[PDB]
Structure 1
Amino acid sequence: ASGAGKAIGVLTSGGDAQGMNAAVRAVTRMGIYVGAKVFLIYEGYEGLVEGGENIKQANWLSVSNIIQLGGTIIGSARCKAFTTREGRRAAAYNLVQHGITNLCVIGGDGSLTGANIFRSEWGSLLEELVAEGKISETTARTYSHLNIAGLVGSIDNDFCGTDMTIGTDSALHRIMEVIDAITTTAQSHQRTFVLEVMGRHCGYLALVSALASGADWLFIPEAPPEDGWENFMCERLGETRSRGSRLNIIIIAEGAIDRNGKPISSSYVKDLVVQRLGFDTRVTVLGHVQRGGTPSAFDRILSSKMGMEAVMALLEATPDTPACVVTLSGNQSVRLPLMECVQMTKEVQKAMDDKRFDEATQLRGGSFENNWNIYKLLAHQKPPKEKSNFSLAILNVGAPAAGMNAAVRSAVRTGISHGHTVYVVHDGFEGLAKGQVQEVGWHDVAGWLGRGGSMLGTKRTLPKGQLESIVENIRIYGIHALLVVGGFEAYEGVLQLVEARGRYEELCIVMCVIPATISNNVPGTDFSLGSDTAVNAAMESCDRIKQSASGTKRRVFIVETMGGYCGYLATVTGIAVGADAAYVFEDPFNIHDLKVNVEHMTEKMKTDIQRGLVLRNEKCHDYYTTEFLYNLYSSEGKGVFDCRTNVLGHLQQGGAPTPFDRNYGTKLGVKAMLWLSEKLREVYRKGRVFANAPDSACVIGLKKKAVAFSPVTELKKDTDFEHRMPREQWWLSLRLMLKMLAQYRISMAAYVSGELEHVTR
């Protein structure tokens, strides 16, 4: 099973997508964990060509304390030698000199194209190399096959076969930090903010940025503006002013073009707006800022997961299997052949070269086209000449979660677009019982994207107590559908209302649960809306804490995280920050395990690494509290390290939503409203809505691959109501990755890696 006797090479090439260091760390540590030798190739294909000093064998400490660093400690370089066979043969020679039959390439589309051409010629290159006399025929029959596992490290997301790439999320963090500097201020005078992103080839960053910020206008190369857009844009900004909206946002990609090949410059759009509107227009150009900063939490977890799965795929790969790219489509890990992804990239580039240009956007991926349609729909209120007698109420139930407001905004716009009479109830089930129902318009949710918490009030009170009041208010207001955006209390309350359909006719209405909670404890989803924000705030506090020892004092920090009994937040935060241990309820531990971990920490702390970090979920143990672990570690570490404690309380809670959470809540809010409208038409009968089947009350998912609708009655089997969490949680396999990255010898036979899948046309 173990990959002993074989060597793995890891290199980074292209633009240094932040989170590359997390991928390199996971690749290295998994490679020497399974017994293989790991060789770090510095400067990418450059050091591959020159070789020699640029190829060094890695130990465990070579990738120590890099997960929080952006860029790449390996370094990346553009080399033209790898383009030509003269340098590529030298690269093959230097790999053979170290017995590196396994190569992991972390880079963009050009990097992976070079890796594909390098595999395709590996046999021919070895033949020409032995022919020229630099390697004997023996020692060339071995190493006859080169194994390539690709990782898409780039901010462009231009690699067509893959949905999400390393560094896209963090580039979005940089972009939205800049936009939030503008929008969160008390907007005082009429001004126009024109943001220029570096999406020269791919406009994905421009698109998701526009969606996350609610941009008034978007210039992306995939969909250039129609002729006469000059007037159409200026009029849009004009009515925006007439509304009283004091700030317009124009997101212009670097590759912005018109229907011809002529590019549209940010300076042109600036001067255009200034001339016709007179708004204070200034162009913000991020430039290198997009590649800068720390990697986001998402980038660290996903880079670590994909680096591990890259190594595992690199060991189970026989001479026959092709070069693969380890990526995630949705939440599911998958391997795609490198050749097909390169071919699709070439097809989209040719299409974008005025061949099938209007039909190139679909080949970019369904996510791009769907994102652009959602953006345009939510941007400007088109007239819904369609009307329906249906009306729906949007609830916010439970704790506040970052991204509830984004979901409510999208739900409101999409429902108004379908002609539904959208209501918002303040304080959730409390207000629904109290009749705090308020008919909502398009502009009443204006600017709700970036606001954290909940603009509607949240209450945890379940509907069972005031059920007579809830059904009375549903009857009075004629509510035909009920959109409940919230945590476990939201799911449980919808479950109670569904179970009470047996008693109350008025509760035979379509219900939908959007899981939105910090704990990620809602059954029927992988990511509760706002768990990403909490993880990001948690790691940032942990990174601050770990940085406070200042490279000299040997100190361990016991950091207590929230999440109730659900350990998701603690474990992922531990992966993101390189925590030594993340104690959680789902992995019960006794004093024997504590002594094992403490002795492990002491041994680690005698080496070069001086800042330890253990996370504790707030409800992981009845007796081994944070104070208990503090006393244990400080006593046993006496004469080696000091111990400190930090209970991250509501620091993990009140933040603005991360860009992932905004886009996520935006999209599933749209999808929830689409599903609501479809179910309401499917269920309207004899002059009224009568929704009584269990499939008419679902939790909107994202369960493995795509968005799902799990009926609450079906989820009740797999729900631990006492602990308010699901019985089977997808993320328990990530404990093994945490423990492996912390030098815990754990037999991870229970970890399942994504299998090969062909590209979806």
Structure 2
Amino acid sequence: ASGAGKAIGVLTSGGDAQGMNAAVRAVTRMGIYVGAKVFLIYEGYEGLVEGGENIKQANWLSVSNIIQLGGTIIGSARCKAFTTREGRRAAAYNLVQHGITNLCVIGGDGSLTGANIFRSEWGSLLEELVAEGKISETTARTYSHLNIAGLVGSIDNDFCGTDMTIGTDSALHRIMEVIDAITTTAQSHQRTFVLEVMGRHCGYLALVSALASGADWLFIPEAPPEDGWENFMCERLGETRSRGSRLNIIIIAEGAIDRNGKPISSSYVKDLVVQRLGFDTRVTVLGHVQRGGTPSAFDRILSSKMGMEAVMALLEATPDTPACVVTLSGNQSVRLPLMECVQMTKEVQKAMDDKRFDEATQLRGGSFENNWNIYKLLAHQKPPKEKSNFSLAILNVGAPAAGMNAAVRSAVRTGISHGHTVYVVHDGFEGLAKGQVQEVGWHDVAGWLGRGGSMLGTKRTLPKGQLESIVENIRIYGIHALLVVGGFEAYEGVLQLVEARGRYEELCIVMCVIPATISNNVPGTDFSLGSDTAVNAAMESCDRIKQSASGTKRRVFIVETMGGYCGYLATVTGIAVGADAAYVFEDPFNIHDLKVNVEHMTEKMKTDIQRGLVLRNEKCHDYYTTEFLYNLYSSEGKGVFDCRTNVLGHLQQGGAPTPFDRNYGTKLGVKAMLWLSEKLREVYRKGRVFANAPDSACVIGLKKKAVAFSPVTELKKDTDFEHRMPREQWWLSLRLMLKMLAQY
């Protein structure tokens, strides 16, 4: 229901971030959905101090066709005048002239501090405007308080209350596009590249893109290199390239410092490599390409959830509420005090200048620390001399999902450095039946991090139909643990082995599932590996289809998407493109709901935005197929719109993985292998079958803020096997957001 009768201003300020359009769209649509008047405040605080034509009221269409655009359509100029009270009092006057009483600020820590101040003295700016007679006392008693909601827009991820600032995944798409370029020309010539990235005082972009690209060295200002590091760098660049590699990538944050706090240049790194290794070396100062291009699916969906919460946080705020920032805390949004988050951010800059680099690391966040610890792991790993008793096998099972190759690389390397004879098995459980098992070395898996598909090959085949032959290859190769990376058939596959431990002495084996699928239907995790590539590959395709519909005015597209029975991929894609419906199995729908969605589609063709998009999950309905919706819309729309169908198929499996699927696949491949190796010493060499307990056969997954390992048999009660998906799924709250942004 609506609940307002009041005005919301919105401004984007400071360094622009691709995602600020999806934010101002969702602040506008949620604002006027809930019955407020929304004002776009053009050119940051500079148009707040000018007012006039810089403050004008939005309608539903004033933010149309912006969700796929980078930068910000309202613009984000700096304003030294608002840093002065003489501008700040005029900024108050311009709001109370338009009657604006609530204000959403999309920006970094500086632009949010300026809003915090502008509340803290608001009533005294109103008092001065009464004292000089520009406004009447009744207005100053009405507009007596300002509500701020902060949306943290920044590419740097510089803000300490939050896992992702709006823009930082898209800036990682820009960096990973440039490294997917530079890897091909560096590999052919055997060159080292110094890549410089926009981590101003925050190393997030540098660490995360180093970890996502396999970079041989890294420079972040929260962990400066210890004295004499030029030796250890020239040893590390030597080692990898002696160990059968060819290029090297060196990531340097623009803000990088040494252990004394003095700046280290990309030029000094280039000169050092040339003069101490004789390697042909280049430097790319990758610039404001990082700030631009289309937002990623995560930055559109995130800016939508953040922008919807920011409107709520404004309208439900009180004059005894501290100003709020909307943020992630894992899987879902949380709301935090602006005062605290600014200070906890200033405390990191102060810890870094104070040479307390370990405090700077710990206080950036747990999400910074887990990335840093996994880079610090893989930076320290080697082929060992000592070797160990255990045999491990790695399977791919299901449809191929982007990030399987990252997870296999990280598991093969963590498995080798923990001393194990790691095996890889081609074609999944049909591979383990057919004996397609081979021992793998550190070389054999090099350059897998950036590849789509599966380098092992994968199948849907469940193990019970071949089980007498699967146990016999487990015996013959001496295999003591399985790591299975894959979808629901990886889960039901490892379950069909625990359900068979009582029947066969060889299935007393340590088992881990990494949930790798497009569909997000594996039980246990809240995110499957490859589902971020899938929403991005579908979101890119629906943008092309919407631009087609917008030129061919009065089209409505029906677009089919590969969710299985699981509506995740259709739901998050529908948000990421502003689809007018997404039809999903987890919602009941019928011809009444369809006829309602068609009469809404009809009423929209009176507007300037004479296009429609509806998404259909491939199994959303038993009889209302994509051709049924095509016929229905074509008929009841005849004389107002025509209609077309696309089926996105195996396009949605994507090409190269996203930055999130490269980090997440690498991080699950190590956390899974550390658990596999831990559990495999929690069972003993004498008088026993190893690991018979249900505690030894698990699925790894991101559950809330960090990972959980869930027993495969414990998950049966959270699972629907008939529809191949979990029984409650966190994202069903996002369907409400889809419908609100779609003008229900």
CA distance change for structure 1 residues 123 and 508 in 2, over 3 Å: closer, same or farther? farther
* 1:76-125 superposed Cα distances (whole Å, 9 cap, x missing partner): 01101221222112212222223322111111111112222222222343
* 1:49-72 superposed Cα distances (whole Å, 9 cap, x missing partner): 111221111111111111001111
CA apart distance, 1:525: 1.6
CA contact (8 A) 1:582 1:616 kept: yes
Q: Tell me how far apart the structure 1 counterparts of residues 411 and 640 of structure 2 sit (CA, whole Å).
A: 56
CA contact (8 A) 1:394 1:485 kept: yes
Q: Secondary structure at the match of 2:319?
A: coil
* 1:595-644 superposed Cα distances (whole Å, 9 cap, x missing partner): 11111111102210022111111111222221222222222222222212
Higher mean C-alpha deviation, range 533-542 or range 425-434: 425-434
CA contact (8 A) 1:214 1:379 kept: no
CA distance change for structure 1 residues 41 and 494 in 2, over 3 Å: closer, same or farther? same
CA contact (8 A) 1:386 1:418 kept: no
1:126 maps to 126
CA apart distance, 1:143: 3.0
Q: Tell me how far apart the structure 2 counterparts of residues 124 and 668 of structure 1 sit (CA, whole Å).
A: 53
TM-score by length of 2: 0.96
CA distance change for structure 1 residues 186 and 559 in 2, over 3 Å: closer, same or farther? farther
CA apart distance, 1:440: 2.2
Q: Tell me how far apart the structure 2 counterparts of residues 360 and 334 of structure 1 sit (CA, whole Å).
A: 23
Q: Secondary structure at the match of 2:142?
A: coil
RMSD of Structure 2 on Structure 1 (CA): 1.9
Higher mean C-alpha deviation, range 370-379 or range 153-162: 370-379
CA apart distance, 1:267: 2.1
Q: Tell me how far apart the structure 2 counterparts of residues 365 and 718 of structure 1 sit (CA, whole Å).
A: 31
Q: Tell me how far apart the structure 1 counterparts of residues 10 and 687 of structure 2 sit (CA, whole Å).
A: 65
CA apart distance, 1:228: 2.2
CA apart distance, 1:358: 4.2
CA distance change for structure 1 residues 607 and 550 in 2, over 3 Å: closer, same or farther? closer
CA apart distance, 1:479: 2.4
CA contact (8 A) 1:680 1:689 kept: no
* 1:412-442 superposed Cα distances (whole Å, 9 cap, x missing partner): 2222232333222222212222332222222
CA contact (8 A) 1:401 1:453 kept: yes
CA contact (8 A) 1:381 1:442 kept: no
CA distance change for structure 1 residues 180 and 233 in 2, over 3 Å: closer, same or farther? same
CA distance change for structure 1 residues 452 and 185 in 2, over 3 Å: closer, same or farther? farther
CA distance change for structure 1 residues 355 and 132 in 2, over 3 Å: closer, same or farther? farther
Q: Secondary structure at the match of 2:38?
A: strand
Q: Secondary structure at the match of 2:62?
A: helix
CA apart distance, 1:520: 1.1
Q: Secondary structure at the match of 2:551?
A: coil
Matched, 1:661 2:669: no
Higher mean C-alpha deviation, range 437-446 or range 204-213: 437-446
CA apart distance, 1:332: 2.0
CA apart distance, 1:689: 6.5
CA contact (8 A) 1:560 1:618 kept: yes
Higher mean C-alpha deviation, range 380-389 or range 585-594: 380-389
CA apart distance, 1:585: 1.5
Higher mean C-alpha deviation, range 260-269 or range 154-163: 260-269
CA distance change for structure 1 residues 595 and 670 in 2, over 3 Å: closer, same or farther? same
1:750 maps to none
Percent identity of paired positions between Structure 1 and Structure 2: 100
Q: Tell me how far apart the structure 2 counterparts of residues 109 and 18 of structure 1 sit (CA, whole Å).
A: 17
CA distance change for structure 1 residues 472 and 185 in 2, over 3 Å: closer, same or farther? farther
1:391 maps to 391
Q: Which runs of 5+ in 1 are unaligned?
A: 744-761
CA apart distance, 1:476: 2.9
Q: Tell me how far apart the structure 2 counterparts of residues 147 and 61 of structure 1 sit (CA, whole Å).
A: 25
CA apart distance, 1:197: 0.8
After the TM superposition, list the runs of 4 or more consecutive aligned residues in structure 1 that deviate by more than 6 angstroms.
none
CA contact (8 A) 1:517 1:529 kept: yes
CA distance change for structure 1 residues 613 and 2 in 2, over 3 Å: closer, same or farther? closer
CA apart distance, 1:390: 3.2
Higher mean C-alpha deviation, range 349-358 or range 250-259: 349-358
* 1:652-707 superposed Cα distances (whole Å, 9 cap, x missing partner): 12411111111111112211122223323334474766323323222112123321
CA contact (8 A) 1:214 1:375 kept: no
Q: Tell me how far apart the structure 2 counterparts of residues 351 and 86 of structure 1 sit (CA, whole Å).
A: 33
Q: Tell me how far apart the structure 2 counterparts of residues 528 and 349 of structure 1 sit (CA, whole Å).
A: 35
Aligned length: 743
CA apart distance, 1:136: 3.4
1:752 maps to none
CA apart distance, 1:514: 0.8
CA contact (8 A) 2:108 2:153 kept: yes
CA apart distance, 1:388: 4.5
Q: Secondary structure at the match of 2:415?
A: helix
Q: Tell me how far apart the structure 1 counterparts of residues 610 and 75 of structure 2 sit (CA, whole Å).
A: 25
Q: Tell me how far apart the structure 2 counterparts of residues 528 and 265 of structure 1 sit (CA, whole Å).
A: 38
Q: Secondary structure at the match of 2:541?
A: helix
CA apart distance, 1:467: 1.6
* 1:218-241 superposed Cα distances (whole Å, 9 cap, x missing partner): 111111122222232223222333
CA distance change for structure 1 residues 477 and 545 in 2, over 3 Å: closer, same or farther? same
CA apart distance, 1:552: 5.7
1:136 maps to 136
Q: Which runs of 5+ in 2 are unaligned?
A: none
CA distance change for structure 1 residues 282 and 614 in 2, over 3 Å: closer, same or farther? same
CA apart distance, 1:355: 4.5
Higher mean C-alpha deviation, range 410-419 or range 659-668: 410-419
CA apart distance, 1:360: 1.7
Q: Tell me how far apart the structure 1 counterparts of residues 246 and 697 of structure 2 sit (CA, whole Å).
A: 40
TM-score by length of 1: 0.94
Higher mean C-alpha deviation, range 183-192 or range 717-726: 183-192
Q: Tell me how far apart the structure 2 counterparts of residues 461 and 54 of structure 1 sit (CA, whole Å).
A: 61
Q: Tell me how far apart the structure 1 counterparts of residues 444 and 84 of structure 2 sit (CA, whole Å).
A: 59
CA contact (8 A) 1:480 1:689 kept: no
CA distance change for structure 1 residues 688 and 11 in 2, over 3 Å: closer, same or farther? farther
CA distance change for structure 1 residues 242 and 687 in 2, over 3 Å: closer, same or farther? farther
Which residues of 2 match residues 462-481 of structure 1 at below 5 A?
A: 462-481=462-481
Q: Tell me how far apart the structure 1 counterparts of residues 337 and 680 of structure 2 sit (CA, whole Å).
A: 42
